[PDB]
Amino acid sequence: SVRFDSVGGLSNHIAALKEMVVFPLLYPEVFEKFKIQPPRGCLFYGPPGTGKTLVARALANECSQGDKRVAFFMRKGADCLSKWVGESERQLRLLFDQAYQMRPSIIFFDQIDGLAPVRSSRQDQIHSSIVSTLLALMDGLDSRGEIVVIGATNRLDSIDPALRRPGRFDREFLFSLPDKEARKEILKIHTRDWNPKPLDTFLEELAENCVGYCGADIKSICAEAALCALRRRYPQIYTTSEKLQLDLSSINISAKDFEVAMQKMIPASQRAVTSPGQALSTVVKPLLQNTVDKILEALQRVFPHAEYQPMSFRPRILIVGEPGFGQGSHLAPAVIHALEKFTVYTLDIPVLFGVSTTSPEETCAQVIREAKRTAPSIVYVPHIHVWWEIVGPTLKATFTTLLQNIPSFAPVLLLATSDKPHSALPEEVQELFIRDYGEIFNVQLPDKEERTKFFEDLILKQAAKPPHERLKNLLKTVVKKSQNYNIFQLENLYAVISQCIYRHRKDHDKTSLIQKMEQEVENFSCSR
Amino acid sequence: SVRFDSVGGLSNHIAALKEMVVFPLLYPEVFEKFKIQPPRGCLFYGPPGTGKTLVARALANECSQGDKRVAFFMRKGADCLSKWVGESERQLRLLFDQAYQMRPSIIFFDQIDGLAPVRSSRQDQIHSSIVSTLLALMDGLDSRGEIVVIGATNRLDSIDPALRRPGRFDREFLFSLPDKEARKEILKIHTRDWNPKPLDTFLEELAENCVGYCGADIKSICAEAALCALRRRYPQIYTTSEKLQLDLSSINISAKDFEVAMQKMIPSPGQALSTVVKPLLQNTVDKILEALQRVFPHANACYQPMSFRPRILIVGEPGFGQGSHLAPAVIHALEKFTVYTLDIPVLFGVSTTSPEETCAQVIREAKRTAPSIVYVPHIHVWWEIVGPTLKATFTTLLQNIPSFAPVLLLATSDKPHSALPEEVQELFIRDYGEIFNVQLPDKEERTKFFEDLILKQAAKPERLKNLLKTVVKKSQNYNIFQLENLYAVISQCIYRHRKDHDKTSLIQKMEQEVENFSCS
Amino acid sequence: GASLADVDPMQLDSSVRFDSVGGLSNHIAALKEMVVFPLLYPEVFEKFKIQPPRGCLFYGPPGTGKTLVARALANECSQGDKRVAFFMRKGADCLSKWVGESERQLRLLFDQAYQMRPSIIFFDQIDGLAPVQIHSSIVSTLLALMDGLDSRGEIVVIGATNRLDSIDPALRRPGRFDREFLFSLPDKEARKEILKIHTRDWNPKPLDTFLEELAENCVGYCGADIKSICAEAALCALRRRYPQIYTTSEKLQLDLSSINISAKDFEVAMQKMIPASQRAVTSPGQALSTVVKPLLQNTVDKILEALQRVFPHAEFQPMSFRPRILIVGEPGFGQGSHLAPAVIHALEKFTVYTLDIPVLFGVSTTSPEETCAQVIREAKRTAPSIVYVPHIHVWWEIVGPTLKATFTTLLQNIPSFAPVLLLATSDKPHSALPEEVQELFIRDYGEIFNVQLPDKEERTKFFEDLILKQAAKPPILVVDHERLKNLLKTVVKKSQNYNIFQLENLYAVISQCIYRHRKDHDKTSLIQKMEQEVENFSC
């Protein structure tokens, strides 16, 4: 049924696999020249929903329907556990011996953590016995060739470390959340055999909003979209116990269905945690997207790992601006979001202090150690000008002598924001961001063009929908009287006009809100 | 087929083993002259992969090969369990007679975790009875020769504590991860019989870069490298069909294949210099090590070394790499000595312990393993980061250390020796050899720092030499940070002009970018 | 076994019986009348009524023979009434902070102890079982189980520990642990007895004078160090004699007549090891090293003579009144580095407690007010004793306002005629110390000693047996024997103002040259090097 085509995105855990399963059968001489004794054990692991059981399934299908003949034995967590006194460790050896007669064969253990927990003398003796009789008869597996043992898990730390050793489980595969190049393939696989195949550009657009999703999260919106189309088209289905008469020809899926379905959906990875990076909303985007792009260009100039081998030496950048220019609230999370596939580690006040029972120094050390472990990563310290005059005198020392110990050309990025200009910051901070290296970005107010696009939809498209030159003058005067607002005032004059419009929904004729609009625009006052 | 020469690294474990288990059994008339009384139980323990069963197999084969004067009973100590009422405890009482009729004997118990676990209200009636008979066949049916029992394990606490008592399993052998020297002979052993004989410099460098590996990993990187050659040489091996025609002579393993397999696999205040920085600071590291030799000669009667309160302080302006590159490279070169760090993120990066208590145990453990090193980097900020009790503890602690005990105190500083507080100034004695002032590198070094880039990669498929000269003409007073920053900036253009056959166009951009690199 | 627990006794070796224990003679003459006599003569303990105690506590540094005495004692009781059982538990073994396993383990252990009867229970390292309700549930049951042994028994409990102050004070009450025994590092006359015990069953028995010589060269050893150097001096002889046995698995023929042990096999064993007094205990008292002896032995003898004026127990109806002494000197005259520890070590048989910085704060991360009270109370409990406060000129400027108030009032609650000495050292002169410190030493009472530099002769003899003999050792041809003496005199003249930290550095910098010229058969390329290193040595 399913055989690799469906498996979209991974494409390298698959090539790395047939050199364990297929090659020792086909080319058993290259392993003799170097005396290789090829590997015999994988260990799939990663967050939930990201593949690896789809992979086990597709591999079983390739074996059963490919080049005869390979056997496939599958165990589900802990099945050897039996009621009598010895029938537990006997079934394991029975399985390994039956797999030797049907060889070549591959053994698959789903959800290891119920079978091989970390041994301890404060637990059941049967678990230690099972782990021992499992790492015994797997060590004596060289003479019993043509057997491959795979095990998929979720908790790599909950597996006995005596098994994660070359000889028992020598390869370890990481199944991570897809990125915008893989989510598009997945969406192509799931909307594959649809009546009116969704345009490639449409899926290209859909793959962007789905940031925290996985294969299981993407498979489900393709179903919620159809379920939304069904009740959009035929609303006379819920208010009925009997059947109806459908034509199955009027039911078509549109982008509104996908968006209303994505409204209800919550990614399985963000059901109990919130990531420190968001995107510009549909409102603020025509106001700051170009600024985001310029920031990314400068970051490329200083952090070329974001585009034979990129050379980077301690990449840092500091986004500076006036207190309302939107750098710690709008710009920096958007920059974090546009740079996906880099793990992000946050160091702001509610992280050092918003978690007690652990001094700030501990968490400050853990963040940098883990960011070193998996490079290239980002360490996000927003609002340093307040961060600095809120911490202790030893935390400054720890923070400065912990990122001086980072290898120079290791690609770890330090991102920070500021409200005071660079000159006003404490001189100890100014030593970290040098201007001649291109590590300081100064945000500026948006130009006339931007401010025009920001209001160009409210006037004149929303103020013309029932249940023109007089509107263009309103647009002109709004853009003129707002040429020196920050972001927090622009997107308030927006809301002020937004509310005005909403209060005239069922009014069948205009020229009651037009003058109301212009009066509310005239009463607006702030001036920083 | 394994007899002691297939074990790299454990040159002291093997000697102690045959000086305590083998020789009292082979030459009983010798150890009776002195009443040495060998043990009746030892125990190997350590992390997984460190050669615990390899030593057992080697010892068995060295007990068989010869004249068979000693018998070896090898028993994986978990398959001795019978799902019955009294049979597993009879195999034990039989194993001990089968080895008393053939004395001398060594009874080996591989993985005794599964034979004698900790009995409590989570154990069965079979394992408790097994322990009760095992610690009766040993304390009673022994103490005269010539049976010696060994057992292997990973955690020393996964065994019943009643077995480790005076008169029972008492001696212990800690198998730990290999250091940089053992990791070289391990690679030699695992590349013993090879077509293309590898060089010794290659294995040396590899052993340097394979940090954190434990033996078995080193056997694995050899395999994963040969899998990187094949894919490099026959990219058509995948998505194909049955073999047809393949030559097993163009699969030569190259040096860049080890560095890919070492990243397709998953595996301290001391780090060697990178390949890029080495030809810039290796000379200074040599000079520092020589000054150490001057003060630390370990790196009644005379004609053995003798030192007096070894102390050295590498001083240099900020940016001279005296605490970023130099001192950890020197700690690396001075391996085979145990190092103990004392800096900020190790005094304060842990709670549930005082900074005054984590400073006394460090000096205690440094005295127990002398000659050792105590490493305090950046004293010019270390001194103003601790409390007034920690200073008065640290000073009296390193004062109570005996006069001639070879504990070295290594430290660094960015402010000059005359800008430090008096309490520190009266701790190094510049009139002695205890202060070392770093200098900028010489023209010879600086020039050779850029040569692979200019001119051996901008011309990689001339006027470059001129540009090269200019690179040395403005970099005269650059510290290490600006130096390697300028080197990384000049290595960027090249990576941007990868697929540009026509030259003289990236040379112009290069000479204008190096004309713009300002680092005042 | 229906009791899934560690309750089995041990089969002890029968060859340990009041003959292998060397150095511990007062303790044995007391344990054999509270453990042995109630079992051997049971008619005196019923003639009147006695019901002897059921408890002993052993404490002291590690390796001092505290398990060995329990073993010897269990073998000594079970010689007429075979046989006394022996149970041994060791605190902190995979049962700490596990409720409620430890309670039933202890209950079953006491049950088994009752079933055998007579028996001896031994808790090695109780610090892991009753350290100062995971904690109350287990100590309360231990107290109830111990306090429930009938007066005659016959069950005897014994406990061992390293620091007496890491044990719950609820244990030290009569009927449970009514006596305590201190196992200290052995002096010379006990070191000789241990050496005679361990080298007793040898064909070619070592000479008595050689054992006398050995007992003095290994100071700071604890029992197990002597065992380790005796059993390793036997391996060096074999290794040096037959080095071709290490590369041959085939048992070759060896003559058991050329493997006789000699010296230079004991000292090569004593080289590669570090003693007990330099490993763990932070023993405040250490004797002068063999290098510094000829320089400071006279000062050490002078202090111990101005110390019997105040502390007339330093010559053992003596009567003293608040014995105090303060040795003062310049910063480098070695009062807190060489003199005071050697003075303390000379005063063995007197228990010594220290109050210095790494003990108040570093060790035992508790409040520094309870540790000072502990040391004062236990110092007067075992008087005559010593309290040692080194470097008061800095000690006083590091403690809090409450610690001074506790210390100054705790040494006035000591009875006036108790022999509890207070020894302190300083680097500022007496009149530079804070006034609360000056109001403790009354120099007209003789409580002050001023250290001075070593005399000309002292320095001469200090450099002599380095610069005349070791500078002419045949590398195993031509030595001058005349300019060596001139160099000795120039060195003695040049160094007539150094303190000790410099006087003993100019001794290590001159000995280095000799090492760099080990093999040179012409002893001339280092004489000039010697005198040019001395010509460039500045304070």
Ligand SMILES: Nc1ncnc2c1ncn2[C@@H]1O[C@H](COP(=O)(O)OP(=O)(O)OP(=O)(O)O)[C@@H](O)[C@H]1O
């Ligand atoms: N890379 C992918 N391409 C296509 N579909 C996918 C992919 N990953 C997941 N899916 C879909 O999501 C479903 C769940 O996948 P799967 O069960 O393999 O995840 P998992 O890692 O095994 O989850 P868990 O670890 O919780 O068991 C699959 O049935 C598959 O239809």
Ligand SMILES: Nc1ncnc2c1ncn2[C@@H]1O[C@H](COP(=O)(O)OP(=O)(O)OP(=O)(O)O)[C@@H](O)[C@H]1O
């Ligand atoms: N010191 C060493 N020298 C050479 N090879 C080694 C060494 N240590 C390990 N190896 C290689 O790694 C393999 C695994 O080592 P080994 O099984 O002896 O240790 P182990 O896994 O701790 O043993 P066990 O865990 O089964 O008791 C060996 O077959 C050997 O080839």
Ligand SMILES: Nc1ncnc2c1ncn2[C@@H]1O[C@H](COP(=O)(O)OP(=O)(O)O)[C@@H](O)[C@H]1O
């Ligand atoms: N006083 C002593 N006399 C003879 N041998 C001793 C003495 N003290 C220690 N030893 C030797 O040291 C070994 C270990 O001593 P041990 O009793 O374990 O010390 P601890 O008191 O710390 O338990 C003993 O087996 C014995 O061989």
